[PDB]
Each structure stands twice: as C-alpha cells, then as structure tokens.
mmCIF file of C-alpha atoms in Angstrom:
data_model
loop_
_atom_site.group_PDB
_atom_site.id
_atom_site.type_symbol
_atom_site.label_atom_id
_atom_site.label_comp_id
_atom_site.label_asym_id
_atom_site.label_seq_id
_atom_site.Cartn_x
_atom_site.Cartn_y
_atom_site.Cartn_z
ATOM 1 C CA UNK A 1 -7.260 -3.148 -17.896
ATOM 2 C CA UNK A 2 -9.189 -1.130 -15.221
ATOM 3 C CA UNK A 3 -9.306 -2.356 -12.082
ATOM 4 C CA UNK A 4 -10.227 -1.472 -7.823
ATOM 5 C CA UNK A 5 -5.882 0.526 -8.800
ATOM 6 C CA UNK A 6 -7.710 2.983 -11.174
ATOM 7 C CA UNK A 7 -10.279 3.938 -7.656
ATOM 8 C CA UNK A 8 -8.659 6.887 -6.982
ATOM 9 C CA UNK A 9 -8.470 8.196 -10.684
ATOM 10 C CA UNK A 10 -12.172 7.589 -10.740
ATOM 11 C CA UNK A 11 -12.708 9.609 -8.009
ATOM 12 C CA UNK A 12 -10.447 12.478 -9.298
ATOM 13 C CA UNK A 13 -12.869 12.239 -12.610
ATOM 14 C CA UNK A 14 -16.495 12.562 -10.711
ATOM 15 C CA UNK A 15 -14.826 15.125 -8.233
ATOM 16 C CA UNK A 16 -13.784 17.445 -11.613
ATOM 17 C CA UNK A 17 -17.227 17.001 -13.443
ATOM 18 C CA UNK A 18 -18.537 20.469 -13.233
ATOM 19 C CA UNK A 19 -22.363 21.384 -11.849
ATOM 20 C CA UNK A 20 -23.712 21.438 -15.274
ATOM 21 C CA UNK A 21 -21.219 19.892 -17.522
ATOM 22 C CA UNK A 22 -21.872 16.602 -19.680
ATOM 23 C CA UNK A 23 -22.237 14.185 -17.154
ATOM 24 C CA UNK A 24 -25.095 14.302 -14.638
ATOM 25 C CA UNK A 25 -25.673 12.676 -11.721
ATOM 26 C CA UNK A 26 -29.162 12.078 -9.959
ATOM 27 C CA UNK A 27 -29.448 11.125 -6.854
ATOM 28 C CA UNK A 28 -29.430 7.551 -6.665
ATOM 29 C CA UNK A 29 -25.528 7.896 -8.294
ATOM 30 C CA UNK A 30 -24.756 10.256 -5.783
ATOM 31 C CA UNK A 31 -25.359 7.976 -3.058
ATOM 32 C CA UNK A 32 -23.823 5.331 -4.796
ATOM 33 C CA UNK A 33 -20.978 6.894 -5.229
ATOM 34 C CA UNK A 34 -21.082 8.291 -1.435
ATOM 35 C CA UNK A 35 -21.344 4.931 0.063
ATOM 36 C CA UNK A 36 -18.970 2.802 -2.464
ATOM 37 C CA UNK A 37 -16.759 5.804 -1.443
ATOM 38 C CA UNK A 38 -17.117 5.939 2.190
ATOM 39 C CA UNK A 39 -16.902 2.113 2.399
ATOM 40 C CA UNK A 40 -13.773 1.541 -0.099
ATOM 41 C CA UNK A 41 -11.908 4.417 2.265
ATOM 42 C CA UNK A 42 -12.991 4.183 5.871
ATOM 43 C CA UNK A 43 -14.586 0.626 5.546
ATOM 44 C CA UNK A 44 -18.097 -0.159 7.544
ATOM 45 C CA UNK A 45 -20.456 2.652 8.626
ATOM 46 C CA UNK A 46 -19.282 4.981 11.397
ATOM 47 C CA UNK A 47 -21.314 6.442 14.364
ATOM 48 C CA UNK A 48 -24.711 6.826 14.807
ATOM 49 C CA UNK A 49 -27.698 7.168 12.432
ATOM 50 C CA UNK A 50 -28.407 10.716 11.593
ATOM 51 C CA UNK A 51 -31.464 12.369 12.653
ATOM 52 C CA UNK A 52 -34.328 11.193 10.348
ATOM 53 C CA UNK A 53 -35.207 14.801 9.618
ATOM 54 C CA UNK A 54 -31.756 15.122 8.388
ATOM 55 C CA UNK A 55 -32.903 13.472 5.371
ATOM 56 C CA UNK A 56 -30.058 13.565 2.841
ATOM 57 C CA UNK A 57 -26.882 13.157 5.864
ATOM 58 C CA UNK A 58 -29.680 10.021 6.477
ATOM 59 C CA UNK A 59 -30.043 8.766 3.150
ATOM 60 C CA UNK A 60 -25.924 9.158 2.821
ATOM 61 C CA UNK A 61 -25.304 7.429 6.007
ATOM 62 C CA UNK A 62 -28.200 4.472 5.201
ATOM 63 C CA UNK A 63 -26.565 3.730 2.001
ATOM 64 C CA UNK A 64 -23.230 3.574 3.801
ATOM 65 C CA UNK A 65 -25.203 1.117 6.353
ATOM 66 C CA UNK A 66 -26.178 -0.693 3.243
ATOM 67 C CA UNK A 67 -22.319 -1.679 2.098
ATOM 68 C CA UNK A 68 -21.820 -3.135 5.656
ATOM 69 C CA UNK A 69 -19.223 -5.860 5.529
ATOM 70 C CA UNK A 70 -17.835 -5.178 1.727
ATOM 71 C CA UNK A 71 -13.996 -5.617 1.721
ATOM 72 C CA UNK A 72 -12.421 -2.180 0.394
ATOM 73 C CA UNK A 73 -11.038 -3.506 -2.504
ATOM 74 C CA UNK A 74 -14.535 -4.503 -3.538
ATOM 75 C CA UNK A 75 -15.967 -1.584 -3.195
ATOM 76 C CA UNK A 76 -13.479 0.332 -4.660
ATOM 77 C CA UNK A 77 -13.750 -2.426 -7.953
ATOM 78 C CA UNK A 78 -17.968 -1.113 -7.643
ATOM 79 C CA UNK A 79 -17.027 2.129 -7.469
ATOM 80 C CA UNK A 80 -15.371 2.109 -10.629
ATOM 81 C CA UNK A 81 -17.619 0.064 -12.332
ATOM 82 C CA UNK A 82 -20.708 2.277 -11.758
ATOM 83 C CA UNK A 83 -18.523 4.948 -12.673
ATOM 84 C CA UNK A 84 -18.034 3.477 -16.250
ATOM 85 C CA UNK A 85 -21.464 2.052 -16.600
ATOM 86 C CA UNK A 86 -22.777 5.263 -15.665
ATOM 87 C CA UNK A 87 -20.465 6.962 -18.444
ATOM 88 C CA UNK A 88 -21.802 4.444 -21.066
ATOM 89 C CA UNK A 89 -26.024 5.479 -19.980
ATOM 90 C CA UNK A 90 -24.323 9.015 -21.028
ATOM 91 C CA UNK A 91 -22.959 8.221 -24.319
ATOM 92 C CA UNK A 92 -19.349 8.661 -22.454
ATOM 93 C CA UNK A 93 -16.323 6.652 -22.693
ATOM 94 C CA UNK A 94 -13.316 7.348 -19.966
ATOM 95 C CA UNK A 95 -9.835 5.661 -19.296
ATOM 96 C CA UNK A 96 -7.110 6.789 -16.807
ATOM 97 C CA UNK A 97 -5.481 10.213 -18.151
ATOM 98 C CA UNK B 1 -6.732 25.130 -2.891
ATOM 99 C CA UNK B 2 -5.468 21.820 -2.709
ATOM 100 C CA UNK B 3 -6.396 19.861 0.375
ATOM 101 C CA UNK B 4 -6.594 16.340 1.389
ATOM 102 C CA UNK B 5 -9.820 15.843 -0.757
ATOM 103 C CA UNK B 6 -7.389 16.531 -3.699
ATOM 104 C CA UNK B 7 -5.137 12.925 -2.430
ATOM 105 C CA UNK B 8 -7.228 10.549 -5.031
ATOM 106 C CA UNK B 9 -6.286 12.756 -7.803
ATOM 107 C CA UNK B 10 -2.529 13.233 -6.406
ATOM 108 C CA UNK B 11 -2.328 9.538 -6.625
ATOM 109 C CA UNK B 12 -3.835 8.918 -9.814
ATOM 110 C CA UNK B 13 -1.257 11.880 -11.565
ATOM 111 C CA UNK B 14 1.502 9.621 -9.618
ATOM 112 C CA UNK B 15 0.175 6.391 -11.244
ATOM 113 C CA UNK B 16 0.138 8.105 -14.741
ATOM 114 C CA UNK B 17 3.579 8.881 -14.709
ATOM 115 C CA UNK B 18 5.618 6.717 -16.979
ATOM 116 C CA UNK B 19 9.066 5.227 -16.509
ATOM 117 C CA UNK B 20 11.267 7.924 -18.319
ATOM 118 C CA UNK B 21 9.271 10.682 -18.415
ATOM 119 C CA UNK B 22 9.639 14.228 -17.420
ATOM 120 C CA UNK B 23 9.220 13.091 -13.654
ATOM 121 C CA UNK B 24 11.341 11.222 -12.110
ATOM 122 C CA UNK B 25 11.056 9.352 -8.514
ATOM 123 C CA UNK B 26 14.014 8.401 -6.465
ATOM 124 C CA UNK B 27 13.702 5.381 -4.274
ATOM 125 C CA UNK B 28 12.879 7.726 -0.866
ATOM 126 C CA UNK B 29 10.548 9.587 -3.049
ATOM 127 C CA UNK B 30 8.583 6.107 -3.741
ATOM 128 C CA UNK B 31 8.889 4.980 -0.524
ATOM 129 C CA UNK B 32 7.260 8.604 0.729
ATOM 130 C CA UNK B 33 4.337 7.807 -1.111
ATOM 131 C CA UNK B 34 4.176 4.546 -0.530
ATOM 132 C CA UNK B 35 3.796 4.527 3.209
ATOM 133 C CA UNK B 36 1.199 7.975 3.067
ATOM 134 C CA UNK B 37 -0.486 6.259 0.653
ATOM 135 C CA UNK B 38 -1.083 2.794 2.712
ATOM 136 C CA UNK B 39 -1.440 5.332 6.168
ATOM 137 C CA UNK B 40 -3.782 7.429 4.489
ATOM 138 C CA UNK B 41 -6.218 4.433 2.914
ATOM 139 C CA UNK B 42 -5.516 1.872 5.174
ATOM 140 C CA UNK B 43 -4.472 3.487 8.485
ATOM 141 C CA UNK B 44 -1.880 2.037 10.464
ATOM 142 C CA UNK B 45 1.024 -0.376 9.497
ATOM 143 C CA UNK B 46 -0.503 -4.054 9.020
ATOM 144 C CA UNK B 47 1.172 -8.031 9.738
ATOM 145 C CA UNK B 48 4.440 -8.730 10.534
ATOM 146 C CA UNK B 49 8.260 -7.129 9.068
ATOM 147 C CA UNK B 50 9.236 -8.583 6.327
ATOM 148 C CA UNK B 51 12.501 -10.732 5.864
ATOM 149 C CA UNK B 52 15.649 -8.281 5.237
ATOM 150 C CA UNK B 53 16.430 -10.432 2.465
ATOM 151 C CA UNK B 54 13.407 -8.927 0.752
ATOM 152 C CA UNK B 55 15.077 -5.505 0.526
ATOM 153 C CA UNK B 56 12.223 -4.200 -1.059
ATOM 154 C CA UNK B 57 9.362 -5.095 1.120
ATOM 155 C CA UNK B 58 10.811 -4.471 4.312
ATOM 156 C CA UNK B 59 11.444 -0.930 3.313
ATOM 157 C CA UNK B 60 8.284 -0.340 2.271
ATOM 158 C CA UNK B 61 6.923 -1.770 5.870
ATOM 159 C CA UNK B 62 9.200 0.064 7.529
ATOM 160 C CA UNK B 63 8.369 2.985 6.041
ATOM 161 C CA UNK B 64 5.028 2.327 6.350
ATOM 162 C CA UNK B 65 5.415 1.895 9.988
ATOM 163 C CA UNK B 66 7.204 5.032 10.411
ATOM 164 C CA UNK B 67 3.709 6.616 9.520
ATOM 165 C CA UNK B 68 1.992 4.969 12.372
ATOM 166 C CA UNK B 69 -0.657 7.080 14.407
ATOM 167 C CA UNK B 70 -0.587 9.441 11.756
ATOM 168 C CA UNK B 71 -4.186 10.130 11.278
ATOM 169 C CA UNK B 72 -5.947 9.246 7.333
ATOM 170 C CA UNK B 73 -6.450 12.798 6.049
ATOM 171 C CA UNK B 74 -2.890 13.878 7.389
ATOM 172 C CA UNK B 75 -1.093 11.409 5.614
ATOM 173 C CA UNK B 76 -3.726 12.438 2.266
ATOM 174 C CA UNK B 77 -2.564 15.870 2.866
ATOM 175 C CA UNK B 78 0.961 14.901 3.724
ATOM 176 C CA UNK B 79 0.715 12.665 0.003
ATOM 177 C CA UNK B 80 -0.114 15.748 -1.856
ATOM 178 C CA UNK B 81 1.929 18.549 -0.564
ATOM 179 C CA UNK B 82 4.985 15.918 -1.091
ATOM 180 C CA UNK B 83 3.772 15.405 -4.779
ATOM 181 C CA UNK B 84 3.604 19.630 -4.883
ATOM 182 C CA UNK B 85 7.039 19.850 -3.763
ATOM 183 C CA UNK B 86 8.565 17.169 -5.646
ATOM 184 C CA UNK B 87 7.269 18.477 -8.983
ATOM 185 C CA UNK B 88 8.313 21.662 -7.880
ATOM 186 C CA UNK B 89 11.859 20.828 -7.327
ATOM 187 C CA UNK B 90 11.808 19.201 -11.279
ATOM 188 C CA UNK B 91 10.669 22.348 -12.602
ATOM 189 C CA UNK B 92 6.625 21.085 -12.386
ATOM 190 C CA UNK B 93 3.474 22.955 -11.736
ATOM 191 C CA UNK B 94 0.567 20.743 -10.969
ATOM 192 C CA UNK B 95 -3.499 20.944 -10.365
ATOM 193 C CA UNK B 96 -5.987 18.309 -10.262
ATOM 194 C CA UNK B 97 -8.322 21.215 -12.899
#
C-alpha cells in the first residue's frame, strides 16, 4: 500500500499536472503542498520571514512556519495523503506508475 | 531540461522498476543511488558504521559517507544524470513527460 516511499512519485505526479489539465489546484493546496514539501525535504523553516508585502513568498514561508517540528517522514506520509484526498474531491483515482 | 527538480520523479521511475525487467541494476549502480539519494534528502551521512559482518549495510554507509559535504541539490542532480546514463548504456531513453 501507499506510504511516506511513494513521496517522491507524488511529487513527480503534481509537478506533471499541466496549467489547465484535469486536476486543479487553488491556493490553499498549493501551499499545502509547498510546506508538506519544504518540510518533508529540508525539514523546519529556513531564514527569515519574507517581507509582508511579499505576500505569496509570505504566505509560502508562513505555512512552512506552520509545519515547525514535523518529522520528514510525516510530512512526506501528509503530503501524499492530501495528494490522494485531493484526487478523490476531483473524481480522480492515482497509484504509483 | 532535466534538472535537480526532476530527482523525485528520477526516484520514483527507479522504484517502479521491477526485478527482471528491461533495466537492470548492478550492486555499484544501487549503491550510487542509494547514497545520492540519502545525501540529497537527508544531507550528510548519519550514526555510527555498521558491523562488517552486515555486508550490506556497511556498504551502503560507506557509500553514503563517501557523499559527505556534497550539497542536497548536487547529489538530486548527481541522482538523475546517473539514472540518464545508466539507461543510456541499456539502450534506454527516459523523461519524467
């Protein structure tokens, strides 16, 4: 079954979804996505906080902030679970392949 | 082109493969990707060496540990372009798509 192993395939499959193709993405699965990401790969928040006016590099970095302290295999096991509960709100199924 | 950001979907193809398919990995092939693959997501080598006894895991480690101070997205890169050449040298053209 699918597990934090199948991270990386998961990321291959939201990297190749094209602009306008069957799956969309709003915002909120964007950042999601950004900060499971960022934290599964680098771990906790880096640097400083961006510029408020720099509003989406702030909202990317502030939901990195917000995943402070998950272990990387955890967030790599959320990661993948969005990714599949976001599939199923889309009348998608995916597996590896 | 391929880059780095391509090294999720590099290791996903890799963990698709199956035993006796068309692509085959030699022991220093596995233990190439191995150690990029634990540089490139979990930066340098980690615990003790292994027990020689345990053939296995102490090549790994030390082949992990040959990778150390190589910076994350050089070992990604590093992960890819290995998995372009290798298919290459079995006859093998690959692309994330």
């Amino acid at each position: 079954h699918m597990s934090a192993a199948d991270f990386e395939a998961a990321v291959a499959y939201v990297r190749s979804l094209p602009k306008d193709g069957p799956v969309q993405l709003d915002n909120a699965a964007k950042l999601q996505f950004y900060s499971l990401y960022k934290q599964a790969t680098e771990g906790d928040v880096t640097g400083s906080q961006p510029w408020a006016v720099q509003v989406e590099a702030r909202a990317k970095w502030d939901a990195w902030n917000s995943c402070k302290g998950m272990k990387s295999e955890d967030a790599k096991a959320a990661y993948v679970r969005r990714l599949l509960t976001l599939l199923r709100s889309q009348g998608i199924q995916w597996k590896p392949g």
